[PDB]
From Swiss-Prot, chain B:
Other comments on record: ATP-binding induces a conformation change.
Highest taxon of source: Eukaryota
Protein family: Belongs to the peptidase M16 family.
Covered range of the whole protein: 771 to 1011 of 1019
Record-given protein name: Insulin-degrading enzyme
Gene this protein is translated from: IDE
Length: 224, 215
């Protein structure tokens, strides 16, 4: 991406009266820092989104977020399908982003420590099926990574993490004032389709090849 | 390239006792600035290289320098065959670079003006056959650009260049400490940094350029 750009386009669903949207973030490759960045950030946004957006704002039932391990590149995505105006819906997405922005500074030490212990036991587990660990290993094999002990490595990194680390992860990469902003949204229209700033104008994507015409490509990973 | 690296590898000849080498520069896309930058820099290092290196220094007969237009990306290339140690020859390459460094400060108004007039008639010359201009046009068509009046546009730009511009061209882009260093050499040794062992590992971790919006 061009490191600060946000583009979007729309697709009209003929049949269904519901609208879809998905917002995507190209963080980085899978370095040991970025795995724990994205896992921790994913864990901290699960329950307040669960609390306010689907429950309280009653947007819809399709409200998903999470990782994107693809092409040796890590990534962050948000999957929400509800029957709303999409820019309105964007406004409440950004409202949840500001909510998390305040929720950064609202973290105690205890919430931090119990939260990363929760993520640790969420991540660390011996398998319960031979097929389970085989699908994970095979998921390495299709990505040619082979980092067999990434778990203990990532936990050793996980113990070395501060609040200010994710602040510095937020400000340049994730915040609205970001020189490292890799943000892209996609609109899926419907059948007939407390503070918001001035977002920049995106552009529509008539030709995705001509879209990608001036976009560079990522390197691939040195295999472990 | 990762904007600073200078990578190299070697190839061993069988038949000829002469050694080859070629040094390449990823400059930028064909913008109107970069066309002038590279053409005028290449021509201003063309004639003193011929005067010093080949004529005066008498290194060898196969000595070449110059542009490389490919994939909508400009480039700079140097083709020298001689029977030498390749790093020895590199030292004289860097010596010619220092020679140019002094030649920056030795430019008069006259050298500047005769040089850009040289460049001008070098670029701006009417065709004498349909196949000539057709080959030029076809050379656009293979890059799908169609900027038919890039000649007068770039020449109108050419007058906007200064001497001090080429200092600005030298420092970040061309020097040895350069932050914008896109430098790569290739050794083609005689019959008898980091190394480049695997071209697969070459392609394993490098980004790709954007392409040009065609005019």
């Amino acid at each position: 991406l061009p490191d600060r750009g946000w583009f979007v386009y729309q697709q009209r669903n003929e049949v269904h009266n519901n609208s879809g949207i998905e917002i995507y973030y190209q963080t980085d490759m899978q370095s040991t820092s970025e795995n724990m960045f994205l896992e921790l950030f994913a864990q901290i946004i699960s329950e307040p989104a669960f609390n306010t957006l689907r429950t309280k704002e009653q947007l819809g039932y399709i409200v998903f977020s999470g990782p994107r391990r693809a092409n040796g590149i890590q990534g962050l995505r948000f999957i929400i399908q509800s029957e709303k105006p999409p820019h309105y819906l964007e406004s409440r997405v950004e409202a949840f982003l500001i909510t998390m922005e305040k929720s950064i500074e609202d973290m105690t030490e205890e919430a931090f420590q119990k939260h990363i212990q929760a993520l640790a036991i969420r991540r660390l587990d011996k398998p319960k099926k031979l097929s389970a660990e085989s699908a994970k290993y095979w998921g390495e094999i299709i990505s040619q990574q082979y980092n067999f002990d990434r778990d203990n490595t990532e936990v050793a990194y996980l113990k070395t993490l501060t609040k200010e680390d994710i602040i510095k992860f937020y400000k340049e990469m994730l915040a609205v004032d970001a020189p490292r902003r890799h943000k892209v949204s996609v609109h899926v229209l419907a059948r007939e389709m407390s503070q918001a700033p001035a977002l920049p104008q995106p552009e529509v994507i008539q030709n995705m090849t001509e879209f990608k015409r001036g976009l560079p490509l990522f390197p691939l990973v040195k295999p472990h």
